[PDB]
Structure formats: structure tokens, C-alpha cells
Design a protein around this ligand. Structure first.
Ligand SMILES: O=C(O)CCc1nc2c(=O)[nH]c(=O)[nH]c2n(C[C@H](O)[C@H](O)[C@H](O)CO)c1=O
Ligand SMILES: O=C(O)CCc1nc2c(=O)[nH]c(=O)[nH]c2n(C[C@H](O)[C@H](O)[C@H](O)CO)c1=O
Ligand SMILES: O=C(O)CCc1nc2c(=O)[nH]c(=O)[nH]c2n(C[C@H](O)[C@H](O)[C@H](O)CO)c1=O
Ligand SMILES: O=C(O)CCc1nc2c(=O)[nH]c(=O)[nH]c2n(C[C@H](O)[C@H](O)[C@H](O)CO)c1=O
Ligand SMILES: O=C(O)CCc1nc2c(=O)[nH]c(=O)[nH]c2n(C[C@H](O)[C@H](O)[C@H](O)CO)c1=O
Lengths: 147, 152, 147, 147, 149
């Protein structure tokens, strides 16, 4: 039972596919507060237009304030072009780079799905499990293991 | 779908670098991005630099050279890559996307992705606002503004 | 036929798919000790939530203490979405970066499999060969060649 | 159009699939001279064994002399193995990196084709358009815009 | 490459997986440098690592200790039942390129990424095939010389 009452957590989420995003953020937040004793005031929630802006939004923010862990949340859905494949690959490498450059743990809350249904399912709707909960716990653990 | 903001950035300086391959698709995109920033975000026509480079490959290099000279709050890279008979499409696309992300992370300047990676001309025009489609350039204009302001 | 009684080895493993993980960590440890004379107290074993946290957990750890070699262990199983493909590529690139940035050898103990059975087989179950043993020996060898 | 009489241009080309390389190099050189007023003596032409050496050859050369733009030319043809895929991806990333690290424009004159015919076609043979011409103009334009 | 490099120092790092294919490759590279380029046997260091994954790391370690004019990374990756082959191949190739560009020392790609044993042995000069190690040897010499001059 890892508890982190003094942890400061940053959550940056995109706004594309908001119906999937919200449940995810909510799940992450609730899990941190109700199961890890993270204080609501210690959780900054910011947003960016799309998943492409995620790495950049996170970099800008951890350069201004101090956080123990960050969760980047976005939802990319495969469309008719190759856009999905290239953005996904670039965003994932980007998130990894910002975390390794900064030394701050960056939790991956990015869904790269084939359709809307797959995303809602992983957001806890239609019988699925909310992955945001798993992300919230990972943030806490990684924040503590960094001291 | 997208979800842009109301935000006004009258003091923002925005740079737009676009390639010149597949111009019929490029113009509508640039125009949409410009009009949106001005008409919906109060960005000033004089505060918007527009430069061009031959193809999408030059996009990351052109942007890097330009943000080294002047000061911008946000940059929009615009290009259109269409799948051809070889594997060129795949490798250029991957390298350019990686490149744009690197330039933005190295410089700290927000780089908005206005790159279309399509299978045919039709898909490009559709995303440029023609034949009943939605002009993506608009979304890009709003993204530039939002990111420029959040970089304070 | 290399012995490394003075080597300090770090092992960071994820916790997703633990049935596959344990045998792998165990085989790596036993091999180092029993065939390479590595000392039980010279082996640190840490864990992180998932494979994504692997590169970050390793970077944080080799920045605190001094190790001669590190072994990153995790198991990624292909699911219904593209997540598997993007996390795999990013983690592998990430582990290579940490090793090249630090000068500390990073042994790849990441299994990227299509299903659970393939992972267990490579962990020594159902008639397979435990790959953790090979990773144990590789850690020792690289630890020594780094002087 | 654009004229660059004072521009210094470097051309590094591989030697695999020479029958396709030559027309490309020639077309690029002629275009720069005849349409952009670049001076023949201001154009260095070097070669490396294969496309893999391209990024390294260019890096070495631009560290020695001063150029306004570089053109990397090579031809990779898909074979029976996956070699083609991995080298292609690595070389293309390498070229972009060398250009971004140095600040010197690097023009992509790499053909990644499925067969010999596709390469000859893009080199101006069998009714096709020589791509070397486009690369020559790009080098000139980027050299000037770098001032 | 009709080039001669009698003063060149060459490093060869090879993995040990699929040794039956590795050996002919290493041997062909060495013989070619010596017999056709006048490289001196004592100027050629040969080191090994467990697998292809360790190649970039072994090379980086070595070129930080001694001085070489060119390096040849040799390894054989064969496609198996999992995705391992695809991800390791990609990471090792990027890794070798990075080590060469970071250090300024030319790195010759002697990595085979094949679908089966036969393809590897063929490219190693067996069963009527051409030994690719020879081309790598010549490439190493040429790039070493062009880095000095
Ligand atoms: O499928 C595609 O890639 C095309 C449509 C699209 N989709 C998404 C998305 O699904 N999720 C997302 O999170 N974003 C999507 N975006 C936006 C992208 O992150 C970025 O904000 C813009 O490129 C401007 O820089 C999209 O444009
Ligand atoms: O399909 C291919 O890749 C071949 C044709 C081609 N297409 C484009 C394009 O579609 N969009 C683009 O934006 N560019 C294309 N280019 C050009 C390329 O970005 C670059 O300017 C040159 O390689 C020289 O540096 C192309 O050459
Ligand atoms: O298949 C997928 O990629 C989706 C499910 C999933 N699987 C794994 C896994 O298989 N192995 C793993 O080792 N991890 C998996 N994870 C977790 C992931 O490493 C990380 O902990 C979070 O993304 C937040 O940073 C997963 O979420
Ligand atoms: O399909 C393959 O990749 C195998 C055959 C091969 N082809 C080429 C090529 O087609 N073009 C090329 O330009 N090069 C090819 N090379 C050589 C490669 O760039 C490099 O010089 C060597 O790996 C040693 O460093 C090749 O080896
Ligand atoms: O196909 C796979 O990737 C699975 C089996 C496997 N194969 C090779 C190989 O074929 N060649 C190789 O050269 N190596 C292989 N390795 C080992 C790998 O380079 C590394 O030494 C370990 O991961 C520990 O760091 C393998 O594990």
C-alpha cells in the first residue's frame, strides 16, 4: 500500500476524443487520492490540443514547476491515412525522451486504438477496466522511488 | 474530433514554414491557419511570418534555421506527403515527423504538426477543406495560439 | 567461463505478467551466483510497474549507486490495439539510450511476444529454455569487459 | 529563379548501383551550374562505399571544409532479407541528424526502391524524370536561405 | 577500393550468436584487409560480445579506451517466432549509427538481418554465395583513410 501525501503530480491530457479522455483523467485522479492519499491540491491538470502537443506541453510545465511524476494522457484513433502510425510513433518516443532528459518519471497514458469502442472500453465503459487507475498508481510508485 | 480554445493572442509571433510539393493542397491549409489565427484569436497579420522550403524533408531544417534567427512563440510546419510506388513515402514521413518533434523539444518552441501523410491526392484535398471536408489548417492555427500562450 | 566476484549487478524488472517475470529473474540470479561467483549481496533487485517504466527506473538507479552491469526485464504481450507495437519500440530504444548515455552495459531481458505461452516457454516452462540464464552470463561478461 | 554563384556545395554519393547513381549526380551538377549559376569548382564530389556510410561521410567532410548545402545520394534496392528496411530507416534518420546537428542543409537524394527499374526511372532513364535535377535546385535554395 | 592502409588500426567487434555464420564473415573481412589493402595483422583488434544487442555498447566501450581508424560491427539476427527480431534489429542498427556519429569514428555495418540460417550462410560465402565480410573489410579501409585525409 504505497502512500504519497506529499507528492506533487502533473497530468497533461489532450482534448481530442474527450469522451474517452475524461473517464481516464478522473480514474487516475480518484485512484491517487482515494488509494494513495495524494492531496487534490497537489495535482495539476493541464491540457493541450492533441497528442502531438503532449511531449511539448509536459516539457514546458516541468521546466516551470517541480513535480514528482507526470502522466501524459491522449487518445489516437486509426483513421484513413498513415497519420495515426507516424504521430503515435513520434509521440511515444517524445514522451520517453522528456522523461529521460528531465529525470522526472513520465507515465504513459496514451491509447493507440483502431476504433472509438476500443478506447471507451479501456476507459472503463461498456464493461471494461479503467486504465487511468493503473496510471495513477504507477505515478505514485515512480514518484516515491525517485524520492 | 478536435476541441480548440477561445484564447486571444494579440502579442503572439507565429512562424509558418510550408513545403511546395502538392501546392494545391498546401495553399488552402496555410490560408485556413492564417485566417483562423487572425479572425478568431486576434493575432496580427504583421506578427505572422510565412516561409517555404522545397519539400517536406526540408521542413525540420527550415524551421530550425528560422527559430535560430528570429523569435517566435509557436511554429506550424506544413507539408503534404503522398504515397507513391516506392518506400520513399514511409521513410521520409517517419524521418520528418521525428525531426519536427526534435526541433520543438531542442528549442523549447512549440512546433505544430501540419503534415499530411496520405495515400492519394483526394485525401489531402479533403483535409484541406475541399470536396466537403474540414480544413485542418484551422485546427492548426488554434493549436499554435494555444501553445504559444501556454509557453507564457 | 568468466568469474566476477567483485561485480555489482542491478536488475530492474516490471510487474506485468509476473508468472513469466519471476522465473526469468530467478534464472538470471542463480546463473550469476552459481556459475560466475557473483555475490548475493552484490545484486540489487528493483521493480517498476510496467515495461514503460523500465528505462526510467534504470536511469534513476544508476545515477544513485554504481553498478557494473544492468539487466532490464519485462514481458510485453501483443493485445487488441497497437499499444504493443509502440511501447515495444520505445522501450527498446530507451534501454539502448540509457546504456549508451551512461557507459553502463544494459542487458536486454525484454520479451516481446504474441501470447502468454511464448513468454512462459522462454522463461523455462513447458520444455523451454530459461533465457534469464543467458542474460545473467551476458551481464557478467559485459561487466568485466567494461573493466 | 534563384542564382547562387558564391555557394559551395558538397555532394557525397555511395557506389552501390552505380548505373543509377551517375545519372543522378550528373543531373544535380548540371542543374546547379546551368540553372543556378553555381561554379563547377565550388562543387565538391566525394564518395563512400554504400548508403550506410553516407551520414558518416558527410559528417566528416562538413567538419573539415565549409559548405552551404550538402546532397546525400544513394540507391537502396530491396533484397531477400530485411536489410533493406533497417538500413533505409537508419540512414534516413542519420542524414536528418547530421543536418540538424551541424546546421548545414542536407538534401535527401536517397532512393529506396523495390527493384532496379524503379531506380533507373527516377534517374531519368526509360522515360522518367531525373530527380537529381530537383535535388540540385533544392540544395541551392536551402543554401541561400541559410544565407 | 584499390586503397592501401598499412598504418590503419581496425577494430572488429562481433557477437557470438550463430557462430557458424559469424566466423566466415570475420575471417573474410580480416583476410581482405590484409591481402588486398596491406593492413597489418597486429593492427587489427578482434573482440566479441554475447549478442547483437551488446554490439553498440561493446564498440562504444572499446573506442573510448583505444584509438581506431575504423570499426566493423558484425552480428547475425535471425527471425524467430516472436517480435524480438524486429525490435532488436531496429535498435541495434540505430545504435551503431549513433556510436559512429557521436565518436567521429567510422562504423561499418556487418549486421545480417535474415529470415533463416540459409540466408546468413549464403551471405557468409557458403553454398555458392559471396562473402560479405570481404566488402566490409574494404569499406573499413576506405573509411579509415578518408577520415584521416
Ligand atoms: O488520425 C490522424 O492523425 C488525423 C486526425 C487527428 N487525430 C488525433 C487523435 O486521434 N488523437 C489526438 O490526440 N490528436 C489527433 N490529432 C491532432 C494532433 O495531435 C495535433 O494536435 C495536430 O497535428 C496539430 O499539431 C489529429 O490531427
Ligand atoms: O514519394 C516520394 O517520396 C518521391 C517524390 C517526393 N514526394 C514529396 C511529397 O509527396 N511531399 C513533399 O513534401 N515532398 C516530396 N518530395 C521531396 C523531398 O521532401 C525532398 O525535397 C527531396 O528528397 C530533396 O531533399 C519528393 O521527392
Ligand atoms: O498491450 C498493451 O500495450 C496494453 C496493456 C499493457 N500491457 C503491458 C504489458 O503487456 N507488459 C508490460 O510490461 N506493461 C504493460 N502495460 C503497462 C505500461 O508498461 C505502463 O506501466 C503504463 O502504460 C503507464 O506508464 C500495459 O498497459
Ligand atoms: O539489401 C541489403 O541491404 C544488402 C546488400 C546491400 N545493398 C546496398 C544497396 O542496395 N544500396 C546501397 O547504397 N548500399 C548497399 N549495401 C551496403 C551498405 O550500405 C554498407 O556499405 C555495408 O552494410 C557495410 O557498412 C549493401 O550491403
Ligand atoms: O530472435 C530473437 O531476438 C530471440 C533470441 C535471440 N536471438 C539473437 C540472434 O538471432 N542474433 C543475435 O546476435 N543475438 C540474439 N539474441 C541475444 C541478444 O542480442 C542479447 O544478447 C540478449 O537480449 C541479452 O541482452 C537473442 O536473444
Amino acid at each position: 500500500d504505497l502512500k504519497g501525501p506529499e507528492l506533487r503530480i502533473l497530468i497533461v491530457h489532450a482534448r481530442w476524443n474527450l469522451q474517452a479522455i475524461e473517464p481516464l483523467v478522473k480514474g487516475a485522479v480518484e485512484t491517487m487520492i482515494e488509494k494513495h492519499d495524494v492531496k487534490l491540491e497537489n495535482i495539476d491538470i493541464e491540457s493541450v490540443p492533441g497528442s502531438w502537443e503532449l511531449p511539448q506541453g509536459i516539457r514546458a510545465s516541468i521546466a516551470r514547476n517541480t513535480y514528482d511524476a507526470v502522466i501524459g494522457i491522449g487518445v489516437l484513433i486509426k483513421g484513413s491515412t498513415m497519420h495515426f502510425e507516424y504521430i503515435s510513433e513520434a509521440v511515444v518516443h517524445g514522451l520517453m525522451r522528456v522523461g529521460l532528459d528531465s529525470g522526472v518519471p513520465v507515465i504513459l497514458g496514451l491509447l493507440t486504438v483502431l476504433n472509438e469502442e476500443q478506447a471507451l472500453y479501456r476507459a472503463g465503459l461498456n464493461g471494461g477496466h479503467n486504465h487511468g487507475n493503473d496510471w495513477g498508481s504507477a505515478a505514485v510508485e515512480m514518484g516515491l522511488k525517485a524520492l
